[PDB]
Subunit: 154 residues, 3 copies
Protein backbone atom coordinates (compact mmCIF):
# COMPACT_ATOMS: atom_id res chain seq x y z
CA UNK A 1 0.00 0.00 0.00
CA UNK A 2 3.07 2.24 0.20
CA UNK A 3 3.18 2.90 -3.54
CA UNK A 4 -0.57 3.50 -3.75
CA UNK A 5 -0.35 6.10 -0.98
CA UNK A 6 2.60 7.80 -2.67
CA UNK A 7 0.68 7.92 -5.96
CA UNK A 8 -2.36 9.42 -4.19
CA UNK A 9 -0.11 11.97 -2.51
CA UNK A 10 1.31 13.11 -5.85
CA UNK A 11 -2.27 13.54 -7.04
CA UNK A 12 -3.21 15.48 -3.87
CA UNK A 13 -0.24 17.80 -4.35
CA UNK A 14 -1.00 18.30 -8.06
CA UNK A 15 -4.64 19.16 -7.36
CA UNK A 16 -3.49 21.62 -4.68
CA UNK A 17 -1.06 23.30 -7.14
CA UNK A 18 -3.89 23.61 -9.64
CA UNK A 19 -6.25 25.18 -7.11
CA UNK A 20 -3.61 27.62 -5.91
CA UNK A 21 -2.97 28.66 -9.52
CA UNK A 22 -6.71 29.29 -9.86
CA UNK A 23 -6.72 31.29 -6.62
CA UNK A 24 -3.89 33.45 -7.94
CA UNK A 25 -5.68 34.13 -11.28
CA UNK A 26 -8.93 34.98 -9.53
CA UNK A 27 -7.15 37.35 -7.12
CA UNK A 28 -5.34 39.23 -9.92
CA UNK A 29 -8.62 39.52 -11.85
CA UNK A 30 -10.41 40.84 -8.75
CA UNK A 31 -7.56 43.32 -8.32
CA UNK A 32 -7.91 44.77 -11.81
CA UNK A 33 -5.43 42.80 -13.93
CA UNK A 34 -6.35 43.39 -17.57
CA UNK A 35 -6.12 40.47 -19.99
CA UNK A 36 -2.53 40.07 -21.13
CA UNK A 37 -1.43 43.24 -19.29
CA UNK A 38 0.90 43.73 -16.35
CA UNK A 39 -1.03 44.67 -13.23
CA UNK A 40 -0.35 47.15 -10.47
CA UNK A 41 -1.32 46.92 -6.82
CA UNK A 42 -0.96 49.12 -3.73
CA UNK A 43 -1.82 49.04 -0.02
CA UNK A 44 -1.93 52.86 -0.04
CA UNK A 45 0.98 53.18 2.38
CA UNK A 46 3.75 55.78 2.08
CA UNK A 47 7.35 54.81 2.82
CA UNK A 48 10.95 55.55 1.74
CA UNK A 49 11.97 54.07 -1.62
CA UNK A 50 14.18 51.37 -0.11
CA UNK A 51 11.11 50.10 1.78
CA UNK A 52 8.96 49.98 -1.37
CA UNK A 53 11.65 47.93 -3.14
CA UNK A 54 11.95 45.56 -0.17
CA UNK A 55 8.16 45.19 0.10
CA UNK A 56 7.47 44.50 -3.60
CA UNK A 57 10.48 42.21 -3.64
CA UNK A 58 8.99 40.29 -0.72
CA UNK A 59 5.85 39.94 -2.86
CA UNK A 60 7.86 38.56 -5.78
CA UNK A 61 7.12 41.75 -7.66
CA UNK A 62 8.99 44.96 -8.44
CA UNK A 63 8.35 48.68 -7.92
CA UNK A 64 5.91 49.87 -10.63
CA UNK A 65 7.37 51.03 -13.94
CA UNK A 66 5.47 52.80 -16.78
CA UNK A 67 6.79 51.72 -20.20
CA UNK A 68 4.22 53.82 -22.06
CA UNK A 69 1.34 56.26 -21.68
CA UNK A 70 -1.17 53.45 -21.10
CA UNK A 71 0.77 51.88 -18.23
CA UNK A 72 1.53 55.32 -16.78
CA UNK A 73 -2.22 55.94 -16.67
CA UNK A 74 -2.89 52.54 -15.08
CA UNK A 75 -0.35 53.24 -12.31
CA UNK A 76 -1.74 56.68 -11.47
CA UNK A 77 -5.26 55.23 -11.45
CA UNK A 78 -4.11 52.47 -9.09
CA UNK A 79 -2.04 54.76 -6.82
CA UNK A 80 -4.51 57.67 -6.52
CA UNK A 81 -1.65 59.62 -4.86
CA UNK A 82 2.01 60.48 -5.43
CA UNK A 83 3.88 57.18 -5.75
CA UNK A 84 7.41 55.94 -6.34
CA UNK A 85 8.39 54.37 -9.66
CA UNK A 86 11.13 51.78 -10.22
CA UNK A 87 13.37 54.46 -11.74
CA UNK A 88 16.49 56.10 -10.23
CA UNK A 89 19.83 57.68 -11.11
CA UNK A 90 21.66 56.54 -7.95
CA UNK A 91 24.25 54.55 -9.92
CA UNK A 92 25.28 57.48 -12.14
CA UNK A 93 23.93 60.98 -11.53
CA UNK A 94 21.82 62.20 -14.42
CA UNK A 95 21.30 58.82 -16.04
CA UNK A 96 17.99 57.29 -15.00
CA UNK A 97 17.82 53.51 -14.96
CA UNK A 98 15.03 51.08 -14.23
CA UNK A 99 15.59 49.24 -10.94
CA UNK A 100 15.26 46.07 -13.02
CA UNK A 101 18.10 47.27 -15.25
CA UNK A 102 18.53 49.35 -18.39
CA UNK A 103 18.48 53.01 -19.38
CA UNK A 104 15.16 54.85 -19.38
CA UNK A 105 13.32 54.65 -22.68
CA UNK A 106 9.85 56.07 -22.16
CA UNK A 107 9.72 59.15 -19.90
CA UNK A 108 7.02 61.61 -18.87
CA UNK A 109 8.81 64.31 -16.88
CA UNK A 110 7.11 67.44 -15.63
CA UNK A 111 8.47 70.72 -17.00
CA UNK A 112 11.81 71.70 -15.40
CA UNK A 113 12.40 68.15 -14.06
CA UNK A 114 14.52 66.18 -13.25
CA UNK A 115 16.67 68.72 -11.38
CA UNK A 116 18.49 66.69 -8.66
CA UNK A 117 17.29 69.30 -6.15
CA UNK A 118 19.02 69.73 -2.76
CA UNK A 119 16.66 72.27 -1.20
CA UNK A 120 14.71 69.55 0.62
CA UNK A 121 17.20 69.19 3.48
CA UNK A 122 16.95 65.39 3.56
CA UNK A 123 20.62 65.35 2.57
CA UNK A 124 21.82 64.68 -0.97
CA UNK A 125 19.99 65.53 -4.17
CA UNK A 126 17.17 63.57 -5.79
CA UNK A 127 17.87 60.12 -7.26
CA UNK A 128 14.42 58.52 -7.13
CA UNK A 129 11.26 59.25 -9.11
CA UNK A 130 7.60 59.53 -8.21
CA UNK A 131 4.46 59.98 -10.27
CA UNK A 132 2.15 62.77 -9.12
CA UNK A 133 -1.61 63.20 -9.56
CA UNK A 134 -1.60 64.39 -13.19
CA UNK A 135 0.72 61.58 -14.24
CA UNK A 136 3.84 63.67 -14.79
CA UNK A 137 7.19 62.64 -13.23
CA UNK A 138 9.54 64.37 -10.77
CA UNK A 139 12.88 63.31 -9.33
CA UNK A 140 12.59 63.29 -5.54
CA UNK A 141 14.75 62.13 -2.66
CA UNK A 142 14.77 58.37 -2.13
CA UNK A 143 14.42 59.20 1.59
CA UNK A 144 11.03 60.88 1.11
CA UNK A 145 7.91 58.79 1.80
CA UNK A 146 5.46 58.07 -1.01
CA UNK A 147 2.88 55.45 -1.98
CA UNK A 148 4.10 51.89 -2.58
CA UNK A 149 2.90 50.48 -5.91
CA UNK A 150 4.09 47.05 -6.95
CA UNK A 151 4.00 45.54 -10.41
CA UNK A 152 3.47 41.92 -11.43
CA UNK A 153 4.08 40.38 -14.93
CA UNK A 154 1.58 40.33 -17.77
Amino acid sequence: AIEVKLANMEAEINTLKSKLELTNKLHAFSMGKKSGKKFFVTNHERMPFSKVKALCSELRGTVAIPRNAEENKAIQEVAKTVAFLGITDEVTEGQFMYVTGGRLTYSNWKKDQPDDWYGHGLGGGEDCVHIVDNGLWNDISCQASHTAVCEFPA
Copy 2:
Protein backbone atom coordinates in the same frame (compact mmCIF):
# COMPACT_ATOMS: atom_id res chain seq x y z
CA ALA B 1 10.40 4.87 8.92
CA ILE B 2 8.82 5.73 5.55
CA GLU B 3 5.24 4.87 6.55
CA VAL B 4 5.55 7.35 9.41
CA LYS B 5 7.09 9.94 7.13
CA LEU B 6 4.30 9.41 4.61
CA ALA B 7 1.61 9.78 7.30
CA ASN B 8 3.10 13.04 8.57
CA MET B 9 3.29 14.38 5.02
CA GLU B 10 -0.40 13.47 4.51
CA ALA B 11 -1.18 15.53 7.59
CA GLU B 12 0.84 18.46 6.14
CA ILE B 13 -1.15 18.21 2.91
CA ASN B 14 -4.48 18.24 4.78
CA THR B 15 -3.36 21.35 6.66
CA LEU B 16 -2.46 23.13 3.42
CA LYS B 17 -5.80 22.21 1.85
CA SER B 18 -7.52 23.82 4.87
CA LYS B 19 -5.32 26.90 4.69
CA LEU B 20 -6.07 27.36 0.97
CA GLU B 21 -9.80 27.06 1.59
CA LEU B 22 -9.42 29.73 4.26
CA THR B 23 -7.56 31.95 1.78
CA ASN B 24 -10.43 31.47 -0.69
CA LYS B 25 -13.13 32.35 1.84
CA LEU B 26 -11.27 35.42 3.11
CA HIS B 27 -10.81 36.64 -0.47
CA ALA B 28 -14.48 36.11 -1.37
CA PHE B 29 -15.39 37.96 1.83
CA SER B 30 -12.98 40.83 1.06
CA MET B 31 -14.53 41.14 -2.40
CA GLY B 32 -18.08 41.37 -1.05
CA LYS B 33 -19.53 37.85 -1.08
CA LYS B 34 -22.63 37.93 1.18
CA SER B 35 -23.42 34.82 3.23
CA GLY B 36 -25.34 32.24 1.22
CA LYS B 37 -25.27 34.42 -1.90
CA LYS B 38 -23.62 34.04 -5.30
CA PHE B 39 -20.36 35.95 -5.58
CA PHE B 40 -19.97 38.57 -8.35
CA VAL B 41 -16.58 40.03 -9.31
CA THR B 42 -14.98 42.13 -12.04
CA ASN B 43 -11.62 43.51 -13.15
CA HIS B 44 -13.47 46.51 -14.63
CA GLU B 45 -12.33 45.71 -18.14
CA ARG B 46 -14.68 46.40 -21.05
CA MET B 47 -14.68 43.83 -23.86
CA PRO B 48 -17.01 42.18 -26.39
CA PHE B 49 -19.34 39.52 -25.00
CA SER B 50 -17.37 36.63 -26.53
CA LYS B 51 -14.38 37.50 -24.36
CA VAL B 52 -16.35 38.00 -21.16
CA LYS B 53 -17.47 34.39 -21.54
CA ALA B 54 -13.90 33.22 -22.18
CA LEU B 55 -12.41 35.09 -19.22
CA CYS B 56 -15.05 33.88 -16.73
CA SER B 57 -14.63 30.28 -17.96
CA GLU B 58 -10.88 30.45 -17.40
CA LEU B 59 -11.65 31.43 -13.80
CA ARG B 60 -14.08 28.52 -13.35
CA GLY B 61 -17.04 30.85 -13.08
CA THR B 62 -19.79 32.05 -15.43
CA VAL B 63 -21.05 35.33 -16.85
CA ALA B 64 -23.05 37.14 -14.16
CA ILE B 65 -26.76 36.31 -14.28
CA PRO B 66 -29.29 38.17 -12.07
CA ARG B 67 -32.17 35.90 -10.95
CA ASN B 68 -33.97 38.55 -8.88
CA ALA B 69 -34.10 42.10 -7.50
CA GLU B 70 -31.47 41.29 -4.88
CA GLU B 71 -28.92 39.94 -7.35
CA ASN B 72 -29.64 42.61 -9.95
CA LYS B 73 -28.76 45.32 -7.43
CA ALA B 74 -25.72 43.34 -6.19
CA ILE B 75 -24.36 43.01 -9.74
CA GLN B 76 -25.18 46.64 -10.42
CA GLU B 77 -23.01 47.77 -7.49
CA VAL B 78 -20.12 45.48 -8.47
CA ALA B 79 -19.85 46.57 -12.09
CA LYS B 80 -20.46 50.22 -11.16
CA THR B 81 -20.60 50.69 -14.94
CA VAL B 82 -22.50 49.22 -17.89
CA ALA B 83 -21.74 45.49 -17.91
CA PHE B 84 -22.87 42.40 -19.85
CA LEU B 85 -25.14 39.77 -18.28
CA GLY B 86 -25.07 36.09 -19.22
CA ILE B 87 -28.31 36.42 -21.23
CA THR B 88 -28.61 36.11 -25.04
CA ASP B 89 -31.08 35.53 -27.88
CA GLU B 90 -28.26 35.02 -30.40
CA VAL B 91 -29.74 31.64 -31.31
CA THR B 92 -33.38 32.56 -31.87
CA GLU B 93 -34.32 36.25 -32.15
CA GLY B 94 -36.69 37.21 -29.35
CA GLN B 95 -35.83 34.19 -27.21
CA PHE B 96 -33.29 35.31 -24.61
CA MET B 97 -31.51 32.36 -23.02
CA TYR B 98 -29.15 32.03 -20.04
CA VAL B 99 -25.57 31.29 -21.12
CA THR B 100 -25.92 28.39 -18.68
CA GLY B 101 -29.23 27.27 -20.20
CA GLY B 102 -32.98 27.80 -19.95
CA ARG B 103 -35.34 30.54 -21.08
CA LEU B 104 -35.22 33.95 -19.41
CA THR B 105 -37.25 34.19 -16.21
CA TYR B 106 -36.52 37.26 -14.09
CA SER B 107 -36.12 40.41 -16.20
CA ASN B 108 -35.70 44.14 -15.53
CA TRP B 109 -36.01 45.73 -18.97
CA LYS B 110 -35.76 49.46 -19.57
CA LYS B 111 -38.90 51.00 -21.10
CA ASP B 112 -39.10 50.09 -24.82
CA GLN B 113 -36.55 47.27 -24.44
CA PRO B 114 -35.91 44.76 -26.03
CA ASP B 115 -36.04 46.34 -29.49
CA ASP B 116 -33.36 44.38 -31.41
CA TRP B 117 -31.99 47.65 -32.83
CA TYR B 118 -29.90 47.34 -36.02
CA GLY B 119 -29.20 51.06 -36.34
CA HIS B 120 -25.81 50.74 -34.63
CA GLY B 121 -24.48 49.76 -38.05
CA LEU B 122 -22.05 47.17 -36.70
CA GLY B 123 -23.38 43.63 -36.98
CA GLY B 124 -26.94 42.38 -37.10
CA GLY B 125 -29.24 43.75 -34.42
CA GLU B 126 -28.89 43.34 -30.68
CA ASP B 127 -28.60 39.84 -29.23
CA CYS B 128 -26.85 40.61 -25.93
CA VAL B 129 -27.89 42.26 -22.68
CA HIS B 130 -26.29 44.76 -20.32
CA ILE B 131 -27.24 46.69 -17.20
CA VAL B 132 -27.14 50.47 -17.20
CA ASP B 133 -26.04 52.45 -14.11
CA ASN B 134 -29.74 52.74 -13.23
CA GLY B 135 -29.91 48.97 -12.85
CA LEU B 136 -32.29 48.43 -15.77
CA TRP B 137 -31.71 46.13 -18.75
CA ASN B 138 -31.20 46.78 -22.45
CA ASP B 139 -30.43 44.46 -25.35
CA ILE B 140 -27.20 45.46 -27.07
CA SER B 141 -24.85 44.33 -29.82
CA CYS B 142 -22.81 41.32 -28.74
CA GLN B 143 -19.81 43.02 -30.32
CA ALA B 144 -20.02 46.16 -28.21
CA SER B 145 -17.59 46.40 -25.29
CA HIS B 146 -18.83 46.37 -21.72
CA THR B 147 -17.48 45.57 -18.27
CA ALA B 148 -16.76 41.90 -17.61
CA VAL B 149 -18.44 40.56 -14.48
CA CYS B 150 -18.17 36.90 -13.48
CA GLU B 151 -20.15 34.97 -10.92
CA PHE B 152 -19.31 32.16 -8.56
CA PRO B 153 -21.74 29.86 -6.68
CA ALA B 154 -23.11 30.78 -3.26
Copy 3:
Protein backbone atom coordinates in the same frame (compact mmCIF):
# COMPACT_ATOMS: atom_id res chain seq x y z
CA ALA C 1 12.57 5.27 -6.26
CA ILE C 2 10.20 5.21 -3.27
CA GLU C 3 12.54 7.15 -0.96
CA VAL C 4 13.57 9.44 -3.78
CA LYS C 5 9.90 10.05 -4.63
CA LEU C 6 9.12 10.75 -0.99
CA ALA C 7 11.97 13.26 -0.68
CA ASN C 8 10.70 15.07 -3.76
CA MET C 9 7.23 15.33 -2.26
CA GLU C 10 8.64 16.90 0.88
CA ALA C 11 10.16 19.51 -1.43
CA GLU C 12 6.86 19.90 -3.34
CA ILE C 13 4.97 20.42 -0.06
CA ASN C 14 7.49 22.94 1.33
CA THR C 15 7.40 24.81 -1.99
CA LEU C 16 3.60 24.94 -1.81
CA LYS C 17 3.68 26.21 1.78
CA SER C 18 5.87 29.12 0.66
CA LYS C 19 3.73 29.90 -2.37
CA LEU C 20 0.55 29.98 -0.28
CA GLU C 21 2.28 32.26 2.24
CA LEU C 22 3.21 34.57 -0.61
CA THR C 23 -0.36 34.50 -1.88
CA ASN C 24 -1.64 35.39 1.61
CA LYS C 25 0.87 38.27 1.89
CA LEU C 26 -0.10 39.77 -1.48
CA HIS C 27 -3.79 39.49 -0.61
CA ALA C 28 -3.38 41.30 2.72
CA PHE C 29 -1.35 43.93 0.85
CA SER C 30 -4.14 44.33 -1.73
CA MET C 31 -6.72 44.58 1.07
CA GLY C 32 -4.91 47.62 2.46
CA LYS C 33 -2.80 46.07 5.24
CA LYS C 34 -0.08 48.51 6.39
CA SER C 35 3.36 47.28 7.47
CA GLY C 36 3.48 45.90 10.99
CA LYS C 37 -0.13 46.97 11.59
CA LYS C 38 -3.35 45.03 12.05
CA PHE C 39 -5.90 45.38 9.27
CA PHE C 40 -9.65 45.36 8.90
CA VAL C 41 -11.78 43.73 6.22
CA THR C 42 -15.54 43.74 5.54
CA ASN C 43 -17.87 42.25 2.91
CA HIS C 44 -20.26 45.12 3.73
CA GLU C 45 -22.94 42.81 5.04
CA ARG C 46 -25.25 43.78 7.88
CA MET C 47 -26.02 41.04 10.39
CA PRO C 48 -26.67 40.39 14.10
CA PHE C 49 -23.57 40.38 16.32
CA SER C 50 -23.51 36.60 16.89
CA LYS C 51 -23.38 36.24 13.10
CA VAL C 52 -20.47 38.66 12.95
CA LYS C 53 -18.55 36.78 15.61
CA ALA C 54 -19.08 33.38 13.99
CA LEU C 55 -18.10 34.75 10.59
CA CYS C 56 -14.88 36.42 11.72
CA SER C 57 -14.01 33.24 13.64
CA GLU C 58 -14.55 31.16 10.49
CA LEU C 59 -12.02 33.47 8.83
CA ARG C 60 -9.60 33.01 11.74
CA GLY C 61 -9.92 36.64 12.66
CA THR C 62 -11.90 38.44 15.35
CA VAL C 63 -14.55 41.17 15.40
CA ALA C 64 -12.95 44.58 14.76
CA ILE C 65 -11.64 46.33 17.88
CA PRO C 66 -10.36 49.94 18.03
CA ARG C 67 -7.42 50.19 20.45
CA ASN C 68 -6.94 53.90 19.73
CA ALA C 69 -8.27 56.78 17.66
CA GLU C 70 -5.92 55.74 14.85
CA GLU C 71 -7.49 52.30 14.55
CA ASN C 72 -10.95 53.68 15.26
CA LYS C 73 -10.68 55.77 12.09
CA ALA C 74 -9.30 52.78 10.13
CA ILE C 75 -12.34 50.68 11.01
CA GLN C 76 -14.55 53.65 10.18
CA GLU C 77 -12.96 54.01 6.73
CA VAL C 78 -13.23 50.32 5.88
CA ALA C 79 -16.83 49.94 7.05
CA LYS C 80 -18.06 53.16 5.44
CA THR C 81 -21.33 52.35 7.26
CA VAL C 82 -22.46 51.67 10.83
CA ALA C 83 -20.57 48.61 12.04
CA PHE C 84 -20.39 46.42 15.15
CA LEU C 85 -17.27 46.44 17.31
CA GLY C 86 -15.80 43.55 19.28
CA ILE C 87 -16.93 45.07 22.59
CA THR C 88 -19.92 44.08 24.77
CA ASP C 89 -21.19 44.31 28.35
CA GLU C 90 -23.03 40.98 28.16
CA VAL C 91 -21.08 39.37 30.99
CA THR C 92 -21.65 42.16 33.50
CA GLU C 93 -24.15 44.91 32.69
CA GLY C 94 -22.47 48.30 32.54
CA GLN C 95 -18.93 47.00 32.11
CA PHE C 96 -17.88 46.74 28.47
CA MET C 97 -15.19 44.17 27.77
CA TYR C 98 -13.37 43.24 24.57
CA VAL C 99 -14.87 40.08 23.11
CA THR C 100 -11.25 38.90 23.29
CA GLY C 101 -11.16 39.62 27.02
CA GLY C 102 -10.26 42.55 29.26
CA ARG C 103 -11.51 46.01 30.20
CA LEU C 104 -11.52 48.96 27.79
CA THR C 105 -8.28 50.91 27.46
CA TYR C 106 -9.78 53.27 24.89
CA SER C 107 -13.32 54.46 24.16
CA ASN C 108 -15.00 57.00 21.90
CA TRP C 109 -18.51 57.07 23.34
CA LYS C 110 -21.07 59.40 21.82
CA LYS C 111 -22.75 61.83 24.24
CA ASP C 112 -25.44 60.21 26.40
CA GLN C 113 -24.12 56.71 25.59
CA PRO C 114 -23.94 53.89 26.67
CA ASP C 115 -27.54 53.93 27.94
CA ASP C 116 -28.69 50.28 27.72
CA TRP C 117 -31.87 51.49 26.03
CA TYR C 118 -34.93 49.25 26.01
CA GLY C 119 -37.11 51.39 23.74
CA HIS C 120 -35.93 49.58 20.60
CA GLY C 121 -38.47 46.79 21.01
CA LEU C 122 -36.07 43.95 20.21
CA GLY C 123 -36.12 42.80 23.81
CA GLY C 124 -33.43 43.28 26.43
CA GLY C 125 -31.36 46.43 26.81
CA GLU C 126 -28.23 47.12 24.74
CA ASP C 127 -25.11 45.03 25.31
CA CYS C 128 -23.28 45.40 21.98
CA VAL C 129 -21.43 48.33 20.43
CA HIS C 130 -21.36 49.85 16.96
CA ILE C 131 -19.41 52.80 15.53
CA VAL C 132 -21.81 55.40 14.12
CA ASP C 133 -21.53 58.91 12.67
CA ASN C 134 -18.26 60.78 13.19
CA GLY C 135 -16.62 57.59 14.43
CA LEU C 136 -18.42 57.82 17.78
CA TRP C 137 -19.62 54.78 19.77
CA ASN C 138 -23.12 53.74 20.85
CA ASP C 139 -24.31 50.67 22.72
CA ILE C 140 -26.87 48.85 20.62
CA SER C 141 -28.90 45.63 20.72
CA CYS C 142 -26.81 42.62 19.74
CA GLN C 143 -29.99 41.51 17.93
CA ALA C 144 -29.79 44.46 15.55
CA SER C 145 -28.00 43.99 12.20
CA HIS C 146 -24.95 46.05 11.30
CA THR C 147 -21.81 45.80 9.13
CA ALA C 148 -19.50 42.86 9.77
CA VAL C 149 -15.88 44.01 10.08
CA CYS C 150 -13.19 41.49 10.98
CA GLU C 151 -9.70 42.12 12.32
CA PHE C 152 -6.49 40.24 11.49
CA PRO C 153 -3.11 40.52 13.39
CA ALA C 154 -0.28 42.95 12.62
